[PDB]
Design a protein around this ligand. Structure first.
Ligand SMILES: *[C@H](O)[C@H](C[C@@H]1CCNC1=O)NC(=O)[C@H](CC(C)C)NC(=O)OCc1ccccc1
Length: 185
């Protein structure tokens, strides 16, 4: 059984850089999202993320909370996630923590597209660090979480689909679960 999603729905935004759009997680005044948002389609083959990072400015990122655009005032990279500092703190930020889960553990996923929540379901982390998700194009940045009383424990951010149809992603510090890397290879 999935957890109720209301506390997490209020944290989802859309992030666009160039023609790449995915989802971000807005907590306090930081938006967390997968770093491959800064890739064009050609970059995705063998990205040099350090080089792409230098060439971006704050105004290259478009962050929207529904119809409201949020101004980006800084950005940094932490492992495989980008952290965009915005000028507005999310007034719906729940009590939360970032946790790294173990194979065998379950968590709920709020699947989102264009910054808008679409569905909620339960997943399990397999021994090879993959999950059998229901993720389509545009789902990157969707998060996995558990609820402990009133505290939302975020444990997964979605990045990619593997050839066999299963899914891989990172914790919220941007470290992959398993030996994968964020390149379309
Ligand atoms: C981000 O929205 C997207 C999610 C994928 C697309 C298909 N289903 C998903 O879960 N991720 C990517 O496009 C990712 C980007 C790299 C720079 C990591 N590449 C990826 O998952 O491989 C391309 C692919 C597309 C469709 C089916 C299988 C693989």
């Amino acid at each position: 059984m999935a957890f109720p999603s209301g506390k997490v729905e209020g944290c989802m935004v859309q992030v666009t850089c160039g023609t790449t759009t995915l989802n971000g997680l807005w907590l306090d005044d930081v938006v967390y999202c997968p770093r491959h948002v800064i890739c064009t389609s050609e970059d995705m083959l063998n990205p040099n993320y350090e080089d792409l990072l230098i060439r971006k400015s704050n105004h290259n990122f478009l962050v929207q909370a529904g119809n409201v655009q949020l101004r980006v005032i800084g950005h940094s990279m932490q492992n495989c996630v980008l952290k965009l500092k915005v000028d507005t703190a999310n007034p719906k930020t729940p009590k939360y923590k970032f946790v790294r889960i173990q194979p065998g553990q379950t968590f709920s996923v709020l699947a989102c597209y264009n910054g808008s929540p679409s569905g909620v379901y339960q997943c399990a982390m397999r021994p090879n660090f993959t999950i059998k998700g229901s993720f389509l194009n545009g789902s990157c940045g969707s998060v996995g979480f558990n609820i402990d009383y009133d505290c939302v424990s975020f444990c997964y951010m979605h990045h990619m689909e593997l050839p066999t149809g299963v899914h891989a992603g990172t914790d919220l510090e941007g470290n992959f679960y398993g030996p994968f890397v964020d390149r379309q290879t």
